[PDB]
Structure formats: C-alpha cells, structure tokens
Amino acid sequence: AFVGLSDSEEKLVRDAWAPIHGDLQGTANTVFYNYLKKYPSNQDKFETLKGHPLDEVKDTANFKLIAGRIFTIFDNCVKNVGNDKGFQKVIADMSGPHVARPITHGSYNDLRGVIYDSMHLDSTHGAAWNKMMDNFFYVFYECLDGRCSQFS
Numbered sequence: 001a002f003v004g005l006s007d008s009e010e011k012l013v014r015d016a017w018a019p020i021h022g023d024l025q026g027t028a029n030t031v032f033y034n035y036l037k038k039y040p041s042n043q044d045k046f047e048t049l050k051g052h053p054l055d056e057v058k059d060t061a062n063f064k065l066i067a068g069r070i071f072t073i074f075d076n077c078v079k080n081v082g083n084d085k086g087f088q089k090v091i092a093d094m095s096g097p098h099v100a101r102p103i104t105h106g107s108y109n110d111l112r113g114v115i116y117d118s119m120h121l122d123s124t125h126g127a128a129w130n131k132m133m134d135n136f137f138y139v140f141y142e143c144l145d146g147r148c149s150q151f152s
C-alpha cells in the first residue's frame, strides 16, 4: 500500500539522501557497478551492456548514462516526498519503459538493497527512508501491472 510520511519523516528522507544528492552521478556509477557485480544476471537486461565483461563496460558514457538516470529518478522522488501526487507522477512516468520488460520484483528489490547498503543509515533515518521506498515500490509495481492511472 501507499502510506504517507510525517514532516519529520519527510525531513529525515531529505537528510538521508543529501550526501548522494551532492554527488549524484558519482554515487550512481558506484551503486550501479556494485549492483551488476553482486547480481550479474541483470547486466543482460541492458542491450547496450549485454555480452561485455562488466569491468570493460563500467567506464563507458553509456553505462554512466544508465546509472545516472536511476539516480535522477530517486532524486526527483526525494524532492517530491511532501507531494503524494507529484512523487507518484515521477514514478508513473518512469514506469512506462519497464512495463512488460522481463525484470523480476527480485531484481528491483536487489537494486533497492544495494542503494540502502550504500547509504549507511542509522535506524531513525533508515525507517523514514524505508517508508519512502515502500511507497516508491508500491506505486512502481502497481504501474508495472497496468494499474498506474489510479495515481492521477
């Protein structure tokens, strides 16, 4: 389900993300590398990376484009944490190209964990961060299964 956050929880989310916000491309490159290294089955999902050793593709503009675009979305969700409909819209618009793509909830959840582990959050910030991410994944999965118009 979608469960709204308090203004304190909204604030904890912004604070949690702030080191990443100030280094979005850098952090994105590292997390995306770490995700494809830990969960290598996912690399084939990207036609542009398919068939290359990960270490050969990690320094390409294209790899960094892919990693950066993920982080831009989360940046925009964090910016919209206080606006349910605007947070939902960010997700709705990015969900479209993932629809009917053969990516499991497991592969998405695996990326979520790599992001989490990278942030080294204390439990107060982690709790607020997980409320936001639970909302993100609720919206995202509803949209993947053709129930996106509900958030309009």
Ligand code: HEM
Pocket: 042, 043, 045, 046, 047, 048, 066, 069, 070, 071, 073, 074, 094, 096, 097, 098, 103, 107, 108, 111
């Ligand atoms: C859950 C966090 C994610 C976010 C915020 C995100 C975001 C985006 C964005 C903004 C785009 C660009 C427009 C588009 O083509 O959709 C995109 C495309 C794409 N997404 Fe993701 N995505 C996520 C997860 C994933 C995962 C885990 C996979 C694969 C195991 C994946 C596979 C793809 C592929 C294959 C494309 C097109 C690739 C290209 O040729 O450049 N996405 N995504």
